[PDB]
Amino acid sequence: PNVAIIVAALKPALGIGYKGKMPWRLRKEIRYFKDVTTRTTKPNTRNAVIMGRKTWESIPQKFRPLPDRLNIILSRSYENEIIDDNIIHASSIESSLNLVSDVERVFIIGGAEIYNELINNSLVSHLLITEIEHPSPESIEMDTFLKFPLESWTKQPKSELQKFVGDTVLEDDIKEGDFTYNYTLWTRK
Numbered sequence: 001p002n003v004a005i006i007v008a009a010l011k012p013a014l015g016i017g018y019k020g021k022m023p024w025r026l027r028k029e030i031r032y033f034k035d036v037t038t039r040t041t042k043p044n045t046r047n048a049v050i051m052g053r054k055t056w057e058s059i060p061q062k063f064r065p066l067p068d069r070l071n072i073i074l075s076r077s078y079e080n081e082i083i084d085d086n087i088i089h090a091s092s093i094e095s096s097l098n099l100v101s102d103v104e105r106v107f108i109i110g111g112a113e114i115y116n117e118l119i120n121n122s123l124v125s126h127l128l129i130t131e132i133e134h135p136s137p138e139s140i141e142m143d144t145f146l147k148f149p150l151e152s153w154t155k156q157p158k159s160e161l162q163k164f165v166g167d168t169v170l171e172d173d174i175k176e177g178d179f180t181y182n183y184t185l186w187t188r189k
């Protein structure tokens, strides 16, 4: 299964959150998030999403786990166990892949502690970074930042991104309030 990292970051500091939660609510970006992590090319198969313990708690308690997707929560306290059909607790990402079978794609959906560690892993080959632009980056309060070495990564064209998402609509320069974001694909050099 292909392991990929999906994230929304504000240029150029690559910020993601403030005081434990996201400092922006983009309606079309959430729709993009729901479509890519669910869509499958192979018959009778489903995609998996790996998240941190703090992200799982921040996600609405009545709207968890995420429907149509295999929810995997990383925790050093919990053992490699299967609770139900959708929720699986694992210590590492290498152990979670061996435990589950018949999975097409694997997505990494948060958070900061997970992003910074899994970027330097051989399993991850693709990045679905949503680069957000703002006229005044200093105005938005931020304390959480991404530590990615994008110099070792190659930015793929829009045609390569379209193949990865399928028939998902990709709009250029999506303006919501003051924010302007674009979907980009990244592969290892």
Ligand SMILES: NC(=O)C1=CN([C@@H]2O[C@H](COP(=O)(O)OP(=O)(O)OC[C@H]3O[C@@H](n4cnc5c(N)ncnc54)[C@H](OP(=O)(O)O)[C@@H]3O)[C@@H](O)[C@H]2O)C=CC1
Pocket (backbone or CB within 6 Å): 006, 007, 008, 009, 016, 017, 018, 019, 020, 021, 022, 023, 051, 052, 053, 054, 055, 056, 074, 075, 076, 077, 090, 091, 092, 109, 110, 111, 112, 113, 114, 115, 117, 144
């Ligand atoms: N815009 C975006 O694309 C998104 C932004 N975010 C932002 O990121 C922030 C969340 O990041 P953060 O606070 O770091 O929370 P995380 O989701 O990264 O979870 C951290 C917790 O997960 C556990 N953990 C971390 N690494 C491992 C590991 N390697 N093995 C086992 N367990 C591990 C630890 O708990 P334990 O010791 O119990 O195991 C730790 O306390 C939020 O503020 C949010 O705003 C998050 C998702 C998306």
Ligand SMILES: CCc1nc(N)nc(N)c1C#CCc1cc(OC)cc(-c2ccc3c(c2)OCO3)c1
Pocket (backbone or CB within 6 Å): 006, 007, 008, 021, 022, 029, 030, 033, 055, 058, 059, 060, 063, 108, 109, 110, 130
């Ligand atoms: C959807 C935001 C997002 N975008 C991208 N590009 N990558 C990501 N990893 C994420 C994310 C995330 C975790 C998260 C945290 C959260 O608490 C603040 C709420 C949501 C969330 C936000 C909107 C939702 C939803 C979940 O279910 C469907 O509608 C989702």
